[PDB]
Design a binder for this molecule. Structure first.
Ligand SMILES: *[C@@H]1O[C@H](CO[C@@H]2O[C@@H](C)[C@@H](O)[C@@H](O)[C@@H]2O)[C@@H](O[C@@H]2O[C@H](CO)[C@@H](O)[C@H](O)[C@H]2NC(C)=O)[C@H](O)[C@H]1NC(C)=O
Lengths: 197, 214, 218
């Protein structure tokens, strides 16, 4: 449809967003080869859900969404329908009727640092679980107790976000992993994000 | 129709110092799609920085790019001997429309060095071919700009000499230069005193080196 | 890693046209943006034009409408670049380079020298620049080799077969009114080690299959 999809601006960008403040790119009126997602680099995980991986280059959709963030290696299995943990409950939540794919690669060389990379952040605590595709950007103060704190940080009075700590000696599970959720949306009568075919 | 415009034109900095190269667009620019190359003489452009910010595989830590919109910046923190080049900034879509910048030339700054000067008559072997080539060598000097004047007898020779300049050394950071005068064997043997007069900043008054045919 | 093999050096006579080729092993040739870049010698990278193969619509730079034409062939997965009406201004290295919609690197090919000239492949004549009897410049003296009248470029110049590497200075070629190329290489040696040690420059011209070694002596 005369353009090719700027997926590169999302997969290979110099810096990724924190999972509590995850990014979303909306993709339209373009063509793309998902070939690439099968044959690729080490440490790639590439579970899929609504579609079979083999057929993506054939199908067409109204709109694709690219959500992207950094989470921690052993937490990459939260990123799948009907799943629990302090990521799926409090940071990034997929539905059950999830038509899409979940790509995720180690990035110790990009994101770790030799003093600690303390500027990737996650959400510790939330009164309620996140509804699917919700993005709670809130600072707050969370009371984990009894006494109210009226918006000050103290005992049992937690500032709700915490910094990951990324050293490159951490070993594969405490190591930063970049994650991208592609979402394939079939809606009204323009279907404008197709593959080579 | 983007026009990227690098600043400055030329950077002389003595080693270890802080090198700062500008690139300006004529519009604003997606900045994921802006790269930085180094080129040293006789080699292909080499990618340093892509996506305005990322270093490419193998490039040392002391290189770094930032910026956005209409204003992007390659920075060399600890400039080294081997770190003069022409640097180009490119913009590039996922579409057929790219552009480059005219370039920025970076070079090492030394204490002024004076040139040693040598003149070389045409070889006998060459003589039998029908041509003569007198050759003048200026050998190891800073700064670049030098003036070379050819004298046949006492006449000055504009238009039949060519200069070539070696690239800056990586140990002592000096240049070299060779001027070649080309006459036919015919004309070469009509005259007698070939001389090479060399003006350079490292020299109080221009040096001459001469030979008499025979 | 997906490789970009360019076609080999060419010589075209002025007024003709040239067609450089660029091939993508594997990958996803159809959804790359393929692009051609020129560098005339002593000058800066010039973008010339580009094509997405899956769209066959190519775009050119305003400096080149009437002359350049980019094309590409999905079956053998190569793009072509066809420059008409050549002149001496067009002697340059011609690179293809690709970007992909999955990554922000632009990948480059090898380069291809096109020389525009009426000359014929000639190899170099090599003459001694023989050291003189000054013997006085810090005990050091200069000698060298003149590499004259060759086409096309390039030449390589070695000293006593890779041994001698310091003091050696090999100058860039200059193109003379001949239409041929000339080049010089000199070495600074201690005058003591003159009439004892033998010096030979090794001059080598692949375009014409010419090797030659002279002995430089006073
Ligand atoms: C952006 O991607 C490059 C290149 O990606 C690799 O090659 C592609 C063809 C594709 O197969 C990718 O999935 C590959 O990972 C990354 O550069 C590579 O990085 C590793 C380690 O840094 C290195 O061993 C390789 O040599 C690199 N390859 C090249 C061509 O440079 C790069 O790290 C990515 N950058 C960001 C910011 O994500």
């Amino acid at each position: 449809i005369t353009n090719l999809c700027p997926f590169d601006e999302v997969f290979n960008a110099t810096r990724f967003a924190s999972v509590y403040a995850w990014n979303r790119k909306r993709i339209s009126n373009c063509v793309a080869d998902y070939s690439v997602l099968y044959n690729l680099a080490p440490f790639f995980t590439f579970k899929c859900y609504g579609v079979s991986p083999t057929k993506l280059n054939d199908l067409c959709f109204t709109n694709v969404y690219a959500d992207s963030f950094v989470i921690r290696g052993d937490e990459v299995r939260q990123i799948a329908p009907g799943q629990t943990g302090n990521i799926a409950d409090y940071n990034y939540k997929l539905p059950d009727d999830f038509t899409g794919c979940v790509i995720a690669w180690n990035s110790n060389k990009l994101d770790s640092k030799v003093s600690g990379n303390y500027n990737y952040l996650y959400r510790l605590f939330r009164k309620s679980n996140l509804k699917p595709f919700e993005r709670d950007i809130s600072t707050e103060i969370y009371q984990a107790g009894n006494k109210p704190c009226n918006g000050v940080a103290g005992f049992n009075c937690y500032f709700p976000l915490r910094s990951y700590s990324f050293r490159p000696t951490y070993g594969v599970g405490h190591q930063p992993y970049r994650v991208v959720v592609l979402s394939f949306e079939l809606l009204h009568a323009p279907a404008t994000v197709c593959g080579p075919k | 129709e983007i026009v990227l415009t690098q600043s400055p034109g030329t950077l002389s900095l003595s080693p270890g110092e802080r090198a700062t190269l500008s690139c300006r667009a004529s519009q604003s620019i997606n900045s994921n799609y802006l790269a930085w190359y180094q080129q040293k003489p006789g080699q292909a452009p080499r990618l340093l920085i892509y996506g305005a910010s990322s270093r490419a595989t193998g490039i040392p830590d002391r290189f770094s790019g930032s910026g956005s919109g209409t204003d992007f910046t390659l920075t060399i923190s600890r400039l080294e001997p081997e770190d003069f080049a022409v640097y180009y900034c490119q913009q590039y879509g996922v579409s057929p429309r790219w552009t480059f910048g005219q370039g920025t030339k970076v070079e090492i700054k030394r204490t002024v060095a004076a040139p040693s000067v040598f003149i070389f008559p045409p070889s006998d072997e060459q003589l039998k071919s029908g041509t003569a080539s007198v050759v003048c060598l200026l050998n190891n000097f800073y700064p670049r700009e030098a003036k070379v004047q050819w004298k046949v007898d006492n006449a000055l020779q504009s238009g039949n000499s060519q200069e070539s300049v070696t690239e800056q050394d990586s140990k002592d950071s000096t240049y070299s230069l060779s001027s070649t005068l080309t006459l036919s064997k015919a004309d070469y043997e009509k005259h007698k005193v070939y001389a090479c007069e060399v003006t350079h900043q490292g020299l109080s008054s221009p040096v001459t080196k001469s030979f008499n045919r025979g | 890693q997906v490789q970009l093999v360019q076609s080999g050096a060419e010589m075209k006579k002025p007024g003709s046209s040239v067609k450089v080729s660029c091939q993508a092993s594997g990958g996803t040739f159809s959804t790359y943006v393929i692009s051609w870049v020129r560098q005339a010698p002593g000058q800066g990278l010039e973008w010339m034009g580009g094509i997405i193969p899956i769209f066959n619509t190519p775009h050119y730079a305003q400096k080149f409408q009437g002359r350049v034409t980019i094309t590409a062939d999905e079956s053998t997965s190569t793009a072509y670049m066809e420059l008409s009406s050549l002149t001496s201004g067009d002697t340059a290295v011609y690179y293809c380079a690709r970007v992909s919609q999955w990554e922000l690197l632009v990948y480059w090919g090898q380069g291809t020298l096109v020389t525009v000239s009426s000359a014929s492949t000639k190899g170099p004549s090599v003459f001694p620049l023989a050291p003189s009897s000054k013997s006085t410049s810090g005990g050091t003296a200069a000698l060298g080799c003149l590499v004259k009248d060759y086409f096309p470029e390039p030449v390589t110049v070695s000293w006593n077969s890779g041994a001698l590497t310091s003091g050696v200075h090999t100058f860039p070629a200059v193109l003379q009114s001949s239409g041929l190329y000339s080049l010089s290489s000199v070495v600074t040696v201690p005058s003591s080690s003159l009439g004892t040690q033998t010096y030979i420059c090794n001059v080598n011209h692949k375009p014409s299959n010419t090797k030659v070694d002279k002995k430089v002596e006073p």
